[PDB]
Subunit: 159 residues, 3 copies
């Protein structure tokens, strides 16, 4: 699926993505919200908080808000490898779940595979936010035991 | 046991418990302090930091500082299920331990049981702060390997 | 090996080590950087940030910047057991790794053994930063699953 562009303005880089980055990992998150990717991204690139992520994926589309080679503030590890070396993928509708959420997760498999090919990132480098800082994220995937199956789809699925 | 109420003023909900909450989990903590429940609560409901918990339990009493159906900021996972769907119980005197602490922990067993029955929360949904953010809390319970026994006490009587 | 001393001035204690401490644990970290122990410590004692560690160990020497019996802000657990009861050991050159790092690690095994017999800290009291707050540190050691072997070498020598 095509990843739509809806990037934050350069004048806000200092707040949303101040550093350049050489992607080495991909971090998967759950939004813990029930908003479409367009809403997640629009809010993220417009507010003034030092909080961001690279792409949001819902049941219908994938939207990029931060250049892949600039950092995002989403892993909670300060200037650690999560925030400074990983591209963050946000999966929408995880708050209430439902068909919309599982559709978004499966679309995220496709998004993650595109990023792996793009930056030559190995399957061992696809990580959970939890692995970087301890936060229970992706919450629904961890709660339902879906991470293992997700990794296998990313590793060799044809989507 | 009786859980006494000494709730934060409504005007501070924006800071201490900004969202309504449908309790789904109970999170157990250790204060890593040697102060009675009353002290813990007084400080928590008055300062202006976005840091809070629902009830503090010591060897003598249990004092609630935040409404059970409003979130508290105690699990370290920002706007995640920890802070937004769990009721936090702080067990006092864990710092130096001793009878005071073990007595408080037994009282916490009752408080957790009461909350479980109140909001129909299953035993598998009683969690450690560590499970939500990786923080080593409840520190004493983890250090002495008491979590399993605590859960069994809660599951029965 | 010999642990040099480049402690911070008493005036900077309120920020680098404002609390006395009775060492009970030893926390091993990775600098996630490629600077020598001299630079790490020097930089750490020059700025006035609420961030510090007790000793930095590279491939050549080991330098202490904070008194062993004073806390150091390095475990990210606020006033928790990691920051208030453990001595923090920073292993240099982990960013890019290389022989320099692996050499700094073995030296760190030495620094840890010395601190263990000096303050009678048991082997199961040697922890990672990750165990205190969930942060992925020591990143390289964890990334390469070198923790189990590290502890085994500390247990024997
Ligand atoms: Zn996340
Ligand atoms: Zn806690
Ligand atoms: Zn560390």
């Amino acid at each position: 699926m095509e990843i739509r562009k809806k990037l934050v303005v350069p004048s806000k880089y200092g707040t949303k993505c101040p550093y350049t980055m050489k992607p080495k990992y991909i971090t998967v998150h759950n939004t813990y919200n029930d908003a479409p990717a367009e809403n997640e991204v629009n809010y993220m690139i417009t507010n003034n908080n030092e909080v961001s992520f690279h792409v949001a994926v819902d049941d219908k589309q994938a939207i990029q808000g931060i250049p892949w080679e600039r950092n995002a503030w989403a892993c909670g590890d300060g200037n650690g490898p999560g925030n400074r070396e990983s591209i963050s993928v946000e999966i929408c509708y995880s708050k209430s779940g439902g068909d919309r959420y599982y559709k978004a997760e499966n679309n995220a498999v496709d998004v993650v595979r595109q990023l792996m090919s793009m930056y030559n990132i190995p399957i061992e480098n696809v990580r959970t936010h939890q692995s970087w800082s301890g936060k229970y994220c992706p919450h629904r995937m961890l709660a339902e035991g879906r991470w293992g199956a997700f990794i296998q789809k990313v590793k060799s699925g044809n989507v």
